[PDB]
Design a protein around this ligand. Structure first.
Ligand SMILES: *[C@@H]1O[C@H](CO)[C@@H](O[C@@H]2O[C@H](CO)[C@@H](O[C@@H]3O[C@H](CO[C@H]4O[C@H](CO)[C@@H](O)[C@H](O)[C@@H]4O)[C@@H](O)[C@H](O[C@H]4O[C@H](CO)[C@@H](O)[C@H](O)[C@@H]4O[C@H]4O[C@H](CO)[C@@H](O)[C@H](O)[C@@H]4O)[C@@H]3O)[C@H](O)[C@H]2NC(C)=O)[C@H](O)[C@H]1NC(C)=O
Ligand SMILES: *[C@@H]1O[C@H](CO)[C@@H](O[C@@H]2O[C@H](CO)[C@@H](O[C@@H]3O[C@H](CO)[C@@H](O)[C@H](O[C@H]4O[C@H](CO)[C@@H](O)[C@H](O)[C@@H]4O)[C@@H]3O)[C@H](O)[C@H]2NC(C)=O)[C@H](O)[C@H]1NC(C)=O
Ligand SMILES: *[C@@H]1O[C@H](CO)[C@@H](O[C@@H]2O[C@H](CO)[C@@H](O[C@@H]3O[C@H](CO)[C@@H](O)[C@H](O)[C@@H]3O)[C@H](O)[C@H]2NC(C)=O)[C@H](O)[C@H]1NC(C)=O
Ligand SMILES: *[C@@H]1O[C@H](CO)[C@@H](O[C@@H]2O[C@H](CO)[C@@H](O[C@@H]3O[C@H](CO)[C@@H](O)[C@H](O)[C@@H]3O)[C@H](O)[C@H]2NC(C)=O)[C@H](O)[C@H]1NC(C)=O
Ligand SMILES: *[C@@H]1O[C@H](CO)[C@@H](O[C@@H]2O[C@H](CO)[C@@H](O[C@@H]3O[C@H](CO)[C@@H](O)[C@H](O)[C@@H]3O)[C@H](O)[C@H]2NC(C)=O)[C@H](O)[C@H]1NC(C)=O
Ligand SMILES: *[C@@H]1O[C@H](CO)[C@@H](O[C@@H]2O[C@H](CO)[C@@H](O[C@@H]3O[C@H](CO)[C@@H](O)[C@H](O)[C@@H]3O)[C@H](O)[C@H]2NC(C)=O)[C@H](O)[C@H]1NC(C)=O
Ligand SMILES: *[C@@H]1O[C@H](CO)[C@@H](O[C@@H]2O[C@H](CO)[C@@H](O[C@@H]3O[C@H](CO)[C@@H](O)[C@H](O)[C@@H]3O)[C@H](O)[C@H]2NC(C)=O)[C@H](O)[C@H]1NC(C)=O
Ligand code: NAG
Ligand code: NAG
Ligand code: NAG
Ligand code: NAG
Ligand code: NAG
Ligand code: NAG
Ligand code: NAG
Ligand code: NAG
Ligand code: NAG
Ligand code: NAG
Ligand code: NAG
Ligand code: NAG
Ligand code: NAG
Ligand code: NAG
Ligand code: NAG
Ligand code: NAG
Ligand code: NAG
Ligand code: NAG
Ligand code: NAG
Ligand code: NAG
Ligand code: NAG
Ligand code: NAG
Ligand code: NAG
Lengths: 121, 431, 121, 121, 40, 48, 45, 37
């Protein structure tokens, strides 16, 4: 438990390590110049990840409710069976080559109910 | 089903990403290794215990060493510029026998700068035979490196002891260390763990002998990708550290020359002790103790007294003789007895002031330490050992700088976090 | 379409380019020093704009619902007629010489219902 | 009134200076190197304080509703009597030697209803 | 009219390649009237 | 641009004059300006 | 000036007062010396 | 330094083969090298 604690723990019931991962993500001469190109990198790394969460209407919640449903092109994985025995490392590898399309799609959908909020009153 | 999607942030996902490392002092006026700009605080690191991770470590391909290799050169070469330089001093020296201190000492004259710009007084100072080189009959004697590159003086207040340091990536990065001493890391580690920052590592410089290294758990490990590799060769981790002692009880005085305005060049004064060359003291049975261990393990990788230890052919002084560094000196020990396949045996050692160790690696002025006024009596451990493959015969080798530091960073790797991930759940609570 | 895409498009129905403007706002020797005073400027440019949205109670929504009504001193512009043919760049010029008052006034109202939230329970 | 305005004013009814404290927190050769180690420090100072607010589920609200109740080990202070005459300087000093526990405990509770939100639907 | 070669000033050899470029600053902030008061 | 000089009230704050490091911070600053403003200039030597 | 110069032959052996201690540099003529007022203040936060 | 500098002994036009009286590499014993300009 701690920094990246419970990394090898359960697939879905290991949510207890979400908060400890988020807190330690930013808070934590020859070296001085290196420190300048060591602290700015840590700053934008946190902001870059926070950029995606902010635009999708799911900033600061650790759950990002959306409207776009699943697509057959990703994979076929059952519920409650793939979610108890599978390495989370391999799960990301399966979608990395096709992960980038989701970011644009959600924002296109996120702007829909953003406009309808004023209309629906 | 009408499956929706959601995003989980802060989930453990990894990626290999070359990046920079910090420094931690973990601890005194100056030091060649800064250890003052480094963050000293290490408040009880967690060393979180991961489990059930089949992670692969690559030891040849790891760039932590390459990142560190450039860092060390930067520290040495940048720590010399803001202090005096030898030049102008490498003029031809009207230099003769010694009038009795003997052997390398060649009491020698300068005929150079005064201090008031113009006058030029004929001062004198000692020098070693290795330092001086011939270009008259036997008086045309100048410095060995004035022909090639400018020469700079070590700055007297700057120390040289290898104060331990720690490296670790900034926030948003993790360090992977697998805690089990059975790995020649090129494949899977199972008992992996995370540490906030690296433990003690001592940046010592030597060749064929790694000193003040890690503490072995009564195990001998040999790590090389291909045991029949034609390039780099065996690297050995030794038994429980062996107490090796070297000393030069040749108490000397310190002379000031004032080579220029506000310069104060320094050189060896004289001898008032006893003419006794530098020597190293290793126990007589320790070398056989470690011998039987590597020998027995060598019978597995290599065909099974057919083991022969022979000296290197030669070609580079930095490789032929073992290199030492204690008390600010730089010994050059004839390593014939260490690798001859063999009380308190005595190992001869010579001393040369000028070293160009940091001129052929990154490129800048050669360094030379000033004499130390006091005794050395430096004692040290030994935990590493290097050999080369030509019945199989082993010879001393190395040469490449990226060898003396591979024995301590084999179990470390920089990894990048990928906290983004997508999951399907039920959704459409919003409009 | 893209970075500042559809800039010359409709006045109010060009909301599709809102998200693409936000994502690219931050993510994107002699010149090493220039780079240092080129990325920090990029960072604060995002934070300074994000500072106004954060305190007004409309962080990460692309709309800022408020309570302060319009004032006669700004301008008289009709609805659905000025909103289909008018240059947005010219629109800002008209109020830029008086825009600064809105920022302070809104938070004087934002902090109001913040207290009433506890009182209303 | 202004930067740290009304610092010596009432304890609970001095919330009017909350917004002005927030805006000024980030917006505001020999010196150039100094400025580099003067502007990055200002950035992380805002982020570090914003890190705690973000993970506790109270980002950008100026009020952090929680579930962890009081504990007898902090102090016994009455309501509406200690809240009208007391130096806020002294208030923080009392708990500063034990304030560190709150940050972890709240997160351990903030993650609970995060999981129950999906379960409760 | 007679023409002669000239120049001299260094800010001439590069003007012919950056005539069609201009650094510009974004102004993402704006105010729009709508219907509101969904909050308290 | 027109500092506010906001006035605090009823504050019992202690200031330490010997222990304050603004002077010590500024003392090194002044030395840096003087010493760093001379390196990009001609040196007298050789003249003595 | 007599203060600047210091004696080391009889009375002509006169060098600078600081050549035997530290290097000597000349301030560039363009660099002014008037104490222009300055202000010190910490960053935001 | 002032160059003891003469005509060309053929190379011609702007070539003016010339001498230096250089400073040598041993920080002493000036040697009289030459090169073109
Ligand atoms: C593997 O690791 C071992 C263990 O560290 C290491 O051996 C150590 O070597 C270092 C030098 O490299 C030794 O430290 C030096 O030791 C002597 C003597 O100090 C001892 O004795 C005095 C007696 O009063 C005690 O007070 C003291 O605590 C020690 O026991 C000195 O030469 C050194 O002091 C000088 O250097 C210091 C560090 O730079 C300075 O702070 C200090 O002021 C001294 O310098 C000043 O004074 C000098 C006086 O002559 C003067 O000449 C200088 O110009 C300057 O003004 C230093 O303490 C240490 O003792 C060794 N440890 C053991 C257990 O033997 C191995 O070297 C290392 N292996 C490798 C390969 O690096
Ligand atoms: C390296 O070689 C150099 C060059 O030879 C050598 O330098 C010499 O050092 C000696 C040290 O004694 C100097 O001799 C002294 O010079 C004057 C003469 O007026 C006096 O100070 C000394 O006389 C006293 O001491 C003598 C004993 O040394 C007595 O016999 C005498 O009665 C007096 O009491 C003494 O003669 C000499 O001048 C220098 N020479 C030069 C050229 O600088 C140096 O010693 C050699 N170094 C080593 C380590 O061998
Ligand atoms: C971080 O970046 C460094 C380089 O900046 C990476 O190391 C280098 O990786 C490249 C390939 O990406 C190697 O290039 C290849 O090397 C040899 C040259 O003989 C040959 O196979 C190819 O022609 C090609 O040039 C390079 O050797 C290697 N090493 C160095 C010193 O540059 C490193 O992989 C990166 N680290 C990560 C991602 O962890
Ligand atoms: C430093 O370099 C100078 C260079 O001038 C050396 O001066 C030389 O000193 C020697 C004696 O040490 C002189 O030799 C003698 O000179 C005259 C004839 O010139 C005569 O007495 C003898 O026949 C003998 O040759 C020499 O002339 C003199 N000059 C030169 C140019 O060599 C000086 O000795 C050097 N000092 C040291 C310590 O090396
Ligand atoms: C600066 O001076 C040194 C010392 O003179 C130069 O060393 C030179 O090294 C070469 C190669 O070893 C010598 O050539 C031959 O080497 C061997 C061993 O002696 C043998 O074949 C011959 O007897 C011969 O010496 C050479 O003699 C030696 N000296 C000179 C003057 O060339 C070094 O190369 C010089 N560096 C530069 C950049 O000029
Ligand atoms: C995988 O690696 C972890 C982390 O190194 C190992 O946990 C370590 O286990 C050892 C042996 O039990 C613990 O040492 C013990 O610690 C205390 C004194 O500090 C005391 O109980 C004993 O005297 C002994 O020294 C060590 O503390 C512990 N490390 C941590 C961070 O908890 C683990 O054993 C490894 N697993 C395998 C299967 O190798
Ligand atoms: C480099 O500079 C030196 C400075 O000493 C030049 O040496 C000069 O060489 C010339 C001949 O080339 C000498 O001239 C002859 O000298 C004597 C009388 O002193 C006599 O043989 C003749 O009547 C004639 O004057 C001259 O003395 C000598 N010294 C000086 C001070 O000029 C040297 O020539 C220069 N080298 C080059 C390549 O420029
Ligand atoms: C999946 O994505 C593709 C490519 O954009 C699209 O044509 C399709 O309609 C989507 N849905 C399904 C169920 O495949
Ligand atoms: C979806 O994957 C499942 C995995 O069990 C498989 O049974 C099914 O046939 C797949 N469907 C298609 C259309 O490939
Ligand atoms: C996970 O466990 C279930 C239940 O025993 C089993 O049916 C399934 O095959 C397992 N999956 C994997 C990938 O081992
Ligand atoms: C790359 O994308 C392909 C589909 O184009 C996929 O099969 C593969 O798993 C992805 N990842 C790789 C090759 O690492
Ligand atoms: C994986 O290792 C964890 C500890 O990290 C252990 O609790 C779990 O039982 C292991 N799972 C398997 C299938 O061995
Ligand atoms: C004198 O120097 C020569 C030449 O280096 C050397 O061979 C000889 O041994 C020396 N003699 C003495 C007595 O020191
Ligand atoms: C740890 O090393 C021991 C000793 O060789 C070995 O038996 C064991 O399998 C290793 N355990 C791991 C890698 O988890
Ligand atoms: C090791 O090197 C030898 C010599 O080049 C080669 O024949 C052999 O295949 C290599 N071993 C491996 C495992 O690649
Ligand atoms: C040498 O190794 C031993 C092993 O017990 C250790 O106690 C000692 O401190 C080591 N010496 C140094 C100088 O690190
Ligand atoms: C070395 O000799 C000097 C001569 O002054 C003396 O002061 C010093 O103590 C000696 N060093 C020893 C005995 O270690
Ligand atoms: C080397 O010195 C150490 C430390 O004083 C000592 O314990 C050891 O016995 C010495 N080595 C030998 C071979 O005597
Ligand atoms: C070492 O090799 C040389 C040839 O390079 C040979 O003459 C000598 O006998 C060898 N020595 C040993 C001890 O094997
Ligand atoms: C080391 O000593 C041996 C004799 O013990 C000698 O043959 C050899 O040349 C020496 N090596 C060096 C580098 O001095
Ligand atoms: C090594 O043994 C010799 C035997 O004469 C002894 O004098 C010496 O002190 C020993 N070395 C140590 C203990 O370091
Ligand atoms: C507009 O602003 C002015 C100036 O603050 C104020 O007096 C007035 O009441 C506001 N409302 C209208 C309708 O003008
Ligand atoms: C407001 O502007 C409109 C523009 O059509 C104009 O008709 C109206 O008279 C203006 N009102 C005032 C009070 O100026
Ligand atoms: C915009 O179009 C409307 C409808 O045709 C027209 O009445 C109005 O004058 C137009 N506005 C401008 C500024 O051209
Ligand atoms: C500037 O402000 C004036 C009134 O102060 C206004 O009329 C004008 O439209 C504003 N904008 C300009 C001149 O661009
Ligand atoms: C207060 O905290 C302590 C220490 O964690 C705990 O035992 C206790 O239950 C908590 N509650 C009260 C009312 O003391
Ligand atoms: C709590 O503090 C109040 C302060 O008025 C005091 O009356 C009360 O006795 C305290 N309770 C305990 C249990 O100490
Ligand atoms: C605050 O005022 C109340 C009401 O007069 C009084 O009872 C209480 O003692 C006061 N508290 C302090 C700390 O002065
Ligand atoms: C420090 O903690 C102690 C108890 O550990 C507490 O009594 C005190 O009020 C705290 N604050 C201080 C001394 O400023
Ligand atoms: C606090 O200061 C205000 C003015 O800022 C003053 O009216 C009030 O009386 C002061 N309170 C006390 C207790 O001194």
């Amino acid at each position: 438990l701690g920094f990246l604690g419970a990394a090898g723990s359960t697939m879905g019931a290991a949510s207890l390590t979400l908060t400890v991962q988020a807190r330690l993500l930013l808070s934590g001469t020859v070296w001085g110049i290196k420190q300048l190109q060591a602290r700015v990198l840590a700053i934008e790394r946190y902001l870059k990840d926070q950029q995606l969460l902010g635009i999708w209407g799911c900033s600061g919640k650790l759950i990002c409710t959306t409207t776009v449903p699943w697509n057959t092109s990703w994979s076929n994985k059952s519920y409650d069976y793939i979610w108890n025995n599978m390495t989370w490392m391999q799960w990301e590898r399966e979608i990395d080559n096709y992960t980038g399309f989701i970011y644009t799609l959600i924002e296109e959908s996120q702007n829909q109910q953003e406009k309808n909020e004023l209309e629906l009153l | 089903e009408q499956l929706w999607v959601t995003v989980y942030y802060g989930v453990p996902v990894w990626r290999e990403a070359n990046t920079t490392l910090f420094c931690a002092s973990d601890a005194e006026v100056h030091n060649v290794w800064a250890t003052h700009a480094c963050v000293p605080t290490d408040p009880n690191p967690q060393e979180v215990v991961m489990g059930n991770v089949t992670e692969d470590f690559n030891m040849w391909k790891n760039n932590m060493v390459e990142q560190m290799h450039e860092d060390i050169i930067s520290l040495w070469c940048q720590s010399l510029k803001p202090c005096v330089k030898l030049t102008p001093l490498c003029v031809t020296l009207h230099c003769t026998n010694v009038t009795t201190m003997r052997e390398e000492m060649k009491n020698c004259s300068f005929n150079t700068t005064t201090v008031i710009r113009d006058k030029i007084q004929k001062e004198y100072a000692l020098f070693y035979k290795l330092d001086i080189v011939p270009i008259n009959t036997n008086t045309s004697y100048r410095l060995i490196n004035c022909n090639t590159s400018v020469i700079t003086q070590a700055c007297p207040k700057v120390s040289f002891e290898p104060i331990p340091i720690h490296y670790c990536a900034p926030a948003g990065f993790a360090i992977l260390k697998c805690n089990n001493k059975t790995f020649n890391g090129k494949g899977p580690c199972r008992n992996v763990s995370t540490v906030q920052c690296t433990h003690g590592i001592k940046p010592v410089v030597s060749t064929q002998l790694l000193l003040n290294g890690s503490l072995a758990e009564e195990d001998i490990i040999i790590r090389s990708e291909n045991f029949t590799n034609n390039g780099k060769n065996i690297i050995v981790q030794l038994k429980e550290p062996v107490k090796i002692n070297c000393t030069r009880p040749g108490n000397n005085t310190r002379r000031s020359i004032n080579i220029g305005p506000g310069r104060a060049f320094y050189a060896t004064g004289a001898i008032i002790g006893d003419i006794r060359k530098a020597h190293c003291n290793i126990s007589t049975e320790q070398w056989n103790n470690t011998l039987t261990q590597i020998v027995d393990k060598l019978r597995e990788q290599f065909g099974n007294k057919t083991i022969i230890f022979n000296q290197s052919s030669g070609g580079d002084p930095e490789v032929v003789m073992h290199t030492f560094n204690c008390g600010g000196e730089f010994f050059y020990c004839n390593s014939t007895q260490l690798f001859n396949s063999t009380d308190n045996i005595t190992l001869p050692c010579r001393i040369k002031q000028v070293i160009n160790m940091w001129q052929e690696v990154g490129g800048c002025g050669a360094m030379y330490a000033p004499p130390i006024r006091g005794q050395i009596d430096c004692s040290s451990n030994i935990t590493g050992l290097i050999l080369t493959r030509d019945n199989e015969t082993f010879r001393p080798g190395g040469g490449n700088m990226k060898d003396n530091w591979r024995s301590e960073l084999y179990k470390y790797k920089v990894v990048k976090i990928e906290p983004l991930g997508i999951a399907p759940t039920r959704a459409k609570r919003r409009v």
